[PDB]
C-alpha cells in the first residue's frame, strides 16, 4: 500500500511509477537531490557518506545515477515496504516470425506474424494474428477448433487458456504493430518477461517496429520515450519497464542442469504438459496449418506463467527488491544486490 513500480531519471529528476494509497498506478516527476553518494562511484567498492550540504549534493549531481535512484527510494520509502503483486502488471509475450533463413533480430527483415501477450492484471492472452502477409494469406484462428483433439483436427489448447484469449486478426503488419504499441501504451508493464525475450522477441519487435513504423513509434514502448539498442548481440532497454527474462530467472534461481533450457524442455520438466507433435516442416507451419501455428504460440506464452506459477520467481524479485529497497533489475546479481546493500545500509 504505497510502493514503487519504476524509478527512472530525466533532467536530473526522478520519474517514478507507483501504486498509490488506493491501488491506482500513478507516475510523478520529482525534483530530487540525494543525501549520500559513494566517492568511488564518481573487486572494489566503497562506503557511502552523507552530503554535508545541499550544495554538495548539487554539484555532485552536476558532475552513479543508479546510487541517485537507490537514494531516492530510501528517502521515499524509508519504512518496511508493504507491496501487493495484484497491483503489479507483469506481462510476457512470444512472437512468431515466418521467413527463410531465420529471424535475426538485428536484421529484422521478415514480417512478424504472431504475438500473444499475457497481462497479469487483465489475466488475458491478447493474441495478434496477421492473416495476410508475404508468405501467403491465411484464415482466422479458431478457438473452438483449437480446443478439439488432434485426431479431430483440434489443437488441444486447454479451455481456461482459450477462455482468456483475446483474438485480434490483422490484414497487414503495419496495423498489427501499430496496435501492439497501443497495448503497451494503455497497459504498460511494470515487469516484462517471456523466454529469451531479451535475446529474440524484444529486439526483433523493436527492430521491426523501428524499421516499419520508424524511430518515434519504437520509443512509444517506453513511457519515458527512451528505448535504446545496446551491443554479435543487441538487447534493447525500455526505460520505465524492467525487462526480466524468465530464462535468466530460471537459470539463476532454479537448480536444474538441463541439457537444453528450451521453452519446451523447461516447460515439459516443470508443468509436465507438452505440445502436440506435428508431422510437417515446422518452418512452414503457418503455411501448412496456421490454426495450429496460433495455438502453439498461445501455449508457449502460458508455459511461462505456468512455470512461474510453480517456481514463484517473479514473487522473489519483488520480495528481494522491496527489501533491499532497490530496482527489480538488481536481484539478478550478487554484486548489484550487495552493492545496493552497501549503500542502503547507511
Binding stretches for a copy of itself (CB under 8 A):
39-40, 43-49, 80, 251-255, 311-313, 315-316, 319-320, 322-324, 331-335, 337-339, 341-342, 344-346
What nine digits make up the cell of 213?
513504423
User: Toward a copy of itself, which CB reaches closer, 6 or 344?
Assistant: 344
Closest distance of CB 83 from a copy of itself, Å: 11
CA distances from 273 to 32, 300, 301 (A): 50, 11, 14
Closest distance of CB 40 from a copy of itself, Å: 4
Q: Give, as one character, the DSSP assignment of residue 259.
A: S
User: Toward a copy of itself, which CB reaches closer, 80 or 100?
Assistant: 80
Identify whether the C-beta of residue 103 lies closer than 8 Å to the C-beta of residue 200. Answer: yes
Identify whether the C-beta of residue 262 lies closer than 8 Å to the C-beta of residue 247. Answer: no
Residue 96 annotated as binding site: yes
Residue 300 annotated as binding site: yes
Closest distance of CB 77 from a copy of itself, Å: 13
Closest distance of CB 325 from a copy of itself, Å: 9
User: Toward a copy of itself, which CB reaches closer, 43 or 259?
Assistant: 43
Residue carrying the nine cell digits 521478415: 110
Q: Residue 172: which residues within 8 A CB-CB, separation 6 or more?
A: 130, 132, 133
Closest distance of CB 276 from a copy of itself, Å: 31
Task: Report the candidate in 22, 127, 169 with the shortest Cα–Cα distance to residue 84.
Answer: 22
DSSP SS3 for 151? helix
User: Toward a copy of itself, which CB reaches closer, 232 or 255?
Assistant: 255
Residue 94 annotated as binding site: yes
| Residues contributing to the annotated binding site for Mg(2+) | 94, 96, 201, 300
Amino acid at each position: 500500500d504505497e510502493f514503487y513500480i519504476s524509478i527512472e531519471t530525466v533532467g536530473n529528476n526522478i520519474v517514478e511509477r507507483y501504486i498509490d494509497e488506493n491501488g491506482k498506478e500513478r507516475t510523478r516527476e520529482v525534483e530530487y537531490l540525494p543525501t549520500m553518494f559513494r566517492h568511488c562511484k564518481e573487486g572494489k567498492n566503497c562506503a557511502p557518506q552523507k552530503f554535508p550540504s545541499m550544495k554538495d549534493a548539487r554539484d555532485w549531481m552536476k558532475r552513479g545515477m543508479n546510487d541517485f535512484k537507490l537514494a531516492y527510494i530510501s528517502d521515499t520509502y524509508g519504512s518496511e515496504i508493504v507491496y501487493d503483486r495484484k497491483f503489479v502488471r507483469v506481462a510476457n509475450c512470444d512472437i512468431e516470425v515466418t521467413g527463410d533463413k531465420f529471424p535475426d533480430p538485428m536484421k529484422a527483415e521478415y514480417e512478424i506474424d504472431a504475438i500473444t501477450h499475457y497481462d497479469s492484471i487483465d489475466d488475458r492472452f491478447y493474441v495478434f494474428d496477421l492473416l495476410n502477409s508475404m508468405y501467403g494469406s491465411v484464415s482466422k484462428w479458431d478457438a473452438k477448433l483449437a480446443a478439439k483433439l488432434d485426431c479431430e483436427g483440434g489443437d488441444e489448447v486447454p479451455q481456461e487458456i482459450l477462455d482468456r484469449v483475446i483474438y485480434m486478426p490483422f490484414d497487414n503488419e503495419r496495423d498489427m504493430l501499430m496496435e501492439y504499441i497501443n497495448l503497451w501504451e494503455q497497459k504498460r508493464p511494470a515487469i516484462f518477461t517471456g523466454w529469451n525475450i531479451e535475446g529474440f522477441d524484444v529486439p526483433y519487435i523493436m527492430n521491426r517496429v523501428k524499421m516499419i513504423l520508424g524511430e518515434r513509434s519504437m520509443k512509444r514502448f517506453s513511457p519515458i520515450g527512451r528505448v535504446k539498442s545496446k551491443l554479435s548481440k543487441e538487447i534493447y532497454s525500455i526505460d520505465g519497464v524492467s525487462i526480466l527474462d524468465y530464462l535468466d530467472l530460471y537459470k539463476k534461481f532454479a537448480f536444474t542442469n538441463l541439457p537444453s533450457f528450451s521453452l519446451e524442455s523447461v516447460a515439459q520438466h516443470e508443468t509436465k504438459k507438452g505440445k502436440l507433435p506435428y508431422d510437417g516442416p515446422i518452418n512452414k507451419l503457418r503455411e501448412t496449418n496456421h490454426q495450429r501455428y496460433i495455438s502453439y504460440n498461445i501455449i508457449d506464452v502460458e508455459s511461462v506463467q505456468a512455470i512461474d506459477k510453480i517456481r514463484g520467481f517473479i514473487d522473489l524479485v519483488l520480495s528481494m527488491s522491496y527489501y533491499a529497497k532497490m530496482p527489480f533489475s538488481g536481484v539478478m546479481s550478487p554484486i548489484k544486490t550487495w552493492d545496493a546493500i552497501i549503500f542502503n545500509s547507511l
